[PDB]
């Protein structure tokens, strides 16, 4: 109906007008007097050398010592990052995995991918082996991201333009989030685990209230598919990484763009983003085969992590901020500090 | 300077590494084929003789094959087609009788052009399969090729039409030097499709081995 289209158009126009009215000064003007952090020198302290294929995902445990990585060789490996020891090696039924998660309790790990199934593995069993605790098969598209809320709740992002909240005890979709018009590629949970943001291929990011299925806000401004998303440590902002070689910072309360992290010599897309413990550094994996450390406030590049010989697909930061783990399409993970 | 528990943990890690090495050695001896095509082509018919990704295993002449039929994936091919980079070959199924209408042949050309001229499949050979040759002959007995091929100057015989379709599918390859396209008219008479796939895979593996030696 023409009336409905006109109503939607005028609502979008009023939203844009409100955003412009709330825009009085960019972050760069306010932060210009802040002293730059200077060059950030990061060295490869550890190298994990167990995988045999492209690594697509990695996650840190609630402790800053254990981490899990996923690769296309059908293996889930849990590393003792302090000693580069392999705690576990979980063989997957489907080797086409593009996501990985570590439970905050440390008792479970999750995996998923082209099989459209999110599999939960029990790491602490009386039998002494890791077993598949539950398989979630309610998605009609490839699993792109999954994050644990607790031992019983997991939120997953799929390529069917929908995100779903699950209940591992029953294995049924407790809630379904349907607001995206394109494949959802990334997911990030708020520190309070009451909200989460998703980045889809429609060049938009949406803020979901996990309590009940609802899209509180929609963030736009990217010019291509969003491949990575990550929440600011404070919890009132998040960063996105798209294929247009730019990273952007959005604030939930202001509901607006804040800063764009782009450089002319960078033309490749961003595969992963993450913050530091204080939020002053924004690490971002690229297809330039190296990670770029961005000053989250001044939007100036601070350092480069050029230890990888292929595309850096996944990147994570420990809870205490002690180290940075970068996975890439060469079968190596690197711990920087 | 490791404690007893640390030494035992290192031993467990070494055992896990050994198991990983054995698994990788076993996996590297398998031939990975990506099966593509249209929704109505003879993909199933190709897969007859032997929710998301459908994986098929079969063995021929002591060689283990793994066909990954990613057909029930209505998502964007751009965001997961890089996962299949490094497969031995791509098996493309095209229905020769899809030239009638509903233009299906043009959709097959578009899909083949997208797959062949892709930044990920720069040097992966494509095994092109042309199915339904008998029904194609039956259709070409009565109906004209000219429906799908307005700029076609040739007789309405099965040989000429089949050759022209093969050429029109082959010339879409821009990387005629780094990638070779093998075409076989699929026939259900006997197990010749598997023989053609094995021959093409052996060709690709020979070329890859020569690349590794630094002599290709």
């Amino acid at each position, epitope marked *: 109906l023409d009336q409905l289209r006109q109503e939607a158009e005028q609502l979008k126009n009023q939203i844009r007008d409100a955003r412009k009215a709330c825009a009085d000064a960019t972050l760069s003007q306010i932060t210009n007097n802040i002293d730059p952090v200077g060059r950030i020198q990061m060295r490869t302290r550890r190298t994990l050398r167990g995988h045999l294929a492209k690594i697509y995902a990695m996650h840190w445990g609630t402790d800053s010592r254990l981490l899990v990585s996923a690769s296309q060789d059908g293996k889930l490996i849990i590393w003792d990052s302090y000693t580069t*020891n392999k705690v576990h090696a979980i063989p997957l039924r489907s080797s086409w995995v593009m996501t990985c998660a570590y439970a905050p309790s440390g008792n479970y790990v999750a995996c998923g991918g082209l099989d459209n199934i999110c599999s939960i593995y029990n790491l602490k069993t009386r039998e002494g082996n890791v077993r598949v605790s539950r398989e979630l098969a309610g998605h009609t598209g490839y699993l792109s991201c999954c994050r644990f809320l607790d031992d019983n709740q997991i939120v997953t992002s799929s390529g069917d333009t929908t995100c779903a909240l699950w209940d591992i005890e029953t294995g049924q979709q407790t809630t379904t989030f349907t607001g995206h018009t394109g494949d959802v590629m990334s997911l990030s949970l708020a520190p309070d685990t009451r909200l989460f943001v998703s980045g889809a291929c429609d060049a938009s990011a949406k803020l979901w209230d996990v309590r009940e299925g609802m899209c509180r806000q929609t963030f736009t401004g990217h010019e291509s598919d969003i491949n990575a998303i990550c929440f600011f440590p404070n919890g009132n902002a998040f960063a996105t990484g798209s294929d247009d070689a730019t990273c952007r910072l959005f604030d939930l309360r202001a509901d607006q763009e804040l800063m764009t992290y782009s450089h002319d010599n960078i033309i490749c897309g961003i595969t992963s983003v993450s913050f530091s413990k204080s939020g002053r550094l924004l690490l971002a994996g690229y297809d330039d085969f190296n990670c770029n450390v961005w000053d989250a406030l001044k939007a100036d590049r601070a350092g480069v992590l050029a230890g990888h010989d292929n595309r850096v697909s996944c990147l994570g930061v420990t809870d205490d901020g002690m180290a940075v783990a970068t996975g890439s399409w060469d079968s190596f993970l690197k711990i920087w500090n | 300077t490791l404690s007893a528990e640390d030494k035992a943990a290192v*031993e467990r890690s070494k055992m896990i590494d050994r198991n990983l090495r054995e698994d990788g050695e076993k996996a590297a001896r398998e031939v990975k084929l990506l099966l593509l095509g249209a929704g109505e082509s003879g993909k199933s018919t190709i897969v007859k003789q032997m929710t998301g990704i459908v994986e098929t295993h079969f063995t021929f002449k002591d060689l283990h094959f793994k066909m990954f039929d990613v057909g029930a994936q209505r998502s964007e091919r751009k965001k997961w087609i890089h996962c299949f980079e490094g497969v031995t070959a791509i098996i493309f199924c095209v229905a020769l009788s899809d030239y009638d209408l509903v233009n299906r042949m043009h959709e097959s050309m578009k899909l083949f052009d997208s797959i062949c001229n892709n930044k990920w499949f720069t040097d992966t050979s494509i095994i092109l399969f042309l199915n339904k040759k008998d029904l194609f002959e039956e259709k070409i007995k009565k109906s004209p090729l000219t429906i799908c091929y307005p700029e076609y100057a040739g007789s309405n015989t099965y040989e000429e039409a089949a050759a022209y379709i093969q050429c029109q599918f082959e010339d879409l390859n821009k990387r005629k030097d780094t990638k070779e396209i093998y075409t076989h008219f699929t026939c259900s008479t006997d197990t010749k499709n598997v023989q053609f796939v094995f021959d093409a895979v052996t060709d690709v593996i020979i070329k890859n081995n020569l690349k590794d030696c630094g002599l290709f």
Partner: single-chain antibody
Framework: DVQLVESGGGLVQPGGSRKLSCSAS????????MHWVRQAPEKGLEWVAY????????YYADTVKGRFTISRDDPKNTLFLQMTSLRSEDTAMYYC??????????????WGQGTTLTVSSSDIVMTQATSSVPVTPGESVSISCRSS???????????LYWFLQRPGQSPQLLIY???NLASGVPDRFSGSGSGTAFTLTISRLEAEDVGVYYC?????????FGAGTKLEL
């Protein structure tokens, strides 16, 4: 569930070559490192031997080195102890403790039912300094154990283990590495202490806590237990 059943006991004349067998069922035996721990009729526990996962590492006690042979055969999930030149000092009940070793693991978590064997006629010294204390239900008691060397390692974890041997029952793991609580153990039990000085606090104790408590060190081989602290009433 997890089960460990041992067989091969009975009377053995001195100089015999009786073999002990331990059948495992209910867990991935091929990945667990297995121990043999004996216990004299009225003395404390004494670690005998140990074979790692994959049989790559094997250790023996000095009292049994050269005479006892340990072996595991994963296919049928069975652990063997080949005892030769048996003497009167080998009259003890032998256990088939299992132990998994990785970051955060809990070794010695499950003990076998025990098989009796009767023979007819630089190590860290761990001291408990006590034999038996009177306790009433609903009370809190503190069991103290002492070590010669410092169990604190440069890693940061002190390798002290606590086991409870209820009357007529196998020892059960309670605290591993002096701080962590074993699975299935109530929160009433607590472990604490520092180098060469540890303490076990059973706050608000009741029935089923009656038995002998043994403190073990896992800093380095050979593994040594305490003399055992007994609870009555």
């Amino acid at each position: 569930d997890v089960q460990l059943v041992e067989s091969g006991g009975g009377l053995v004349q001195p100089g015999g070559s009786r073999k002990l067998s331990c059948s495992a069922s209910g867990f991935a035996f091929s990945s667990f490192g297995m121990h043999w721990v004996r216990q004299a009729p009225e003395k404390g526990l004494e670690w005998v031997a140990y074979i790692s996962s994959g049989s790559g590492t094997i250790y023996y006690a000095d009292t049994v080195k050269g005479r006892f042979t340990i072996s595991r055969d994963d296919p049928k999930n069975t652990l063997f102890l080949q005892m030769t030149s048996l003497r009167s000092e080998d009259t003890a009940m032998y256990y088939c403790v299992r132990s998994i070793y990785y970051y955060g693991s809990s070794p010695f978590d499950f003990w076998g039912q025990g098989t009796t064997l009767t023979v007819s006629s630089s190590d860290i010294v761990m001291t408990q300094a006590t034999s038996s204390v009177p306790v009433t239900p609903g009370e809190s008691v503190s069991i103290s154990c002492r070590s010669s060397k410092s169990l604190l390692h440069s890693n940061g974890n002190t390798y002290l283990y606590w086991f409870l041997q209820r009357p007529g029952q196998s020892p059960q793991l309670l605290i591993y590495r002096m701080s962590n609580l074993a699975s299935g153990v109530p929160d009433r039990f607590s472990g604490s202490g520092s180098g060469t000085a540890f303490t076990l606090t059973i706050s608000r104790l009741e029935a089923e806590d009656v038995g002998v408590y043994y403190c073990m060190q896992h800093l380095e081989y050979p593994l040594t237990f305490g003399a055992g602290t007994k609870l009555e009433l």
